[PDB]
């Protein structure tokens, strides 16, 4: 296995019926609450209890990150309560690990992570290659519902002698 997850999500609150559970089996009942984005903040530490769903972080390619110090999930074992978070403390891949992460909190909205601005390796922070394009990942429509009509295509990039293959959606 690689870039996969067992169970380090959940922790969602129902709150209002805004369709936040739309992407759980999203074959139907998918839609955007209101579309007519802003730059993200620095990458530090995460809080597990409020985050709902997998947190997708963007190096050259999409990668899932499990809770720091590792978590469990099998049943029938004596113990009490789950509260373990993950880390995203990262600088840009050439000098560090990845650009920035993106997730959806407990009420149904999206929270983005990012790095301080200074071609994509120089000043890029989030999954957004350009304002009109973004890196396609299985839960893109969930974190960015306004980008449903974006057209997808396959590209390739370099980040220090390693070729990364990507699917990207753009406005046209």
């Amino acid at each position, epitope marked *: 296995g690689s*870039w996969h997850i067992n169970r380090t999500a959940l922790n969602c609150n129902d709150s209002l019926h805004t369709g936040f559970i739309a992407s759980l089996f999203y074959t139907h009942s998918f839609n955007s609450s209101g579309c007519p984005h802003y730059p993200p903040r620095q990458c530090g530490v995460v809080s597990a209890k409020t985050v709902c769903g997998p947190v997708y972080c963007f190096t050259p*390619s999409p990668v899932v990150v499990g809770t720091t110090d590792r978590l469990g999930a099998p049943t029938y074992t004596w113990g009490e309560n789950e509260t373990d978070v993950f880390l995203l403390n990262s600088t840009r891949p050439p000098l560090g690990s990845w650009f920035g992460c993106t997730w959806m909190n407990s009420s149904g909205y999206t929270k983005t992570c990012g790095a301080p601005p200074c071609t994509y390796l120089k000043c890029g922070s989030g999954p957004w290659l350009t304002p009109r394009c973004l890196i396609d990942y299985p839960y893109r429509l969930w974190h960015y519902p306004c980008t449903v009509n974006y057209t997808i295509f*396959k*590209i390739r990039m370099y980040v220090g002698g390693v*070729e*990364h*293959r990507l*699917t990207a959606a753009c406005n046209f």
Partner: antibody
Amino acid sequence: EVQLQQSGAELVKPGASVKLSCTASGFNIKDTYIHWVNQRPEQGLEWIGRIDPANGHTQYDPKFQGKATITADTSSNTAYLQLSSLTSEDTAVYYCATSDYSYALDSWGQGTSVTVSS
Amino acid sequence: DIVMTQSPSSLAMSVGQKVTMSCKSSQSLLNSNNQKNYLAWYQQKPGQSPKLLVYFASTRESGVPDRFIGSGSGTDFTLTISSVQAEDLADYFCQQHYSTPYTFGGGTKLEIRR
């Protein structure tokens, strides 16, 4: 480029079938088109076909339709070229390559030599 | 199918010379939307796998030295080496990545004069 590993050279009896493999390393095949190209001894490169592992959509060459069959397994990050009822004209080196939106074969494999003889 | 014709077939140039080889397609490979020529060049060294040198007729692939230049447009293209080294000995193919099926060229075998 990107790392691709093909199966060993295969000797096939005339009239049998053979399934060649192409394993990707360091990336996911869902993000690239996987092409298969044959090269016959002292002959030019001849494009067999292509596949999109994201949806399974294949696209073959009019001359290889019915004999060549391209499949892709995303859980194992592998591509497969099935050749049915081979003849002496099929004795060739089969390369698997990757391409992006431009359909330009940037990364290739080591090649699989398929010899059809009795 | 698009019929690619490479010229010449055999080619022998001494070390350090500038060598040119032409590729002509039966159909213009120019896409009027993006104004780009859909042609790629491949280098196959003896007993090796082909390597992409220059795609989109002019865009040089990352890693290839800048001594390889892909020029030309429309129906006529040319791969040139400003200063050929002893390691540039290979067979050079041209392939249209425009319409299905993607046809390759006949092949220009490049010898080296010593």
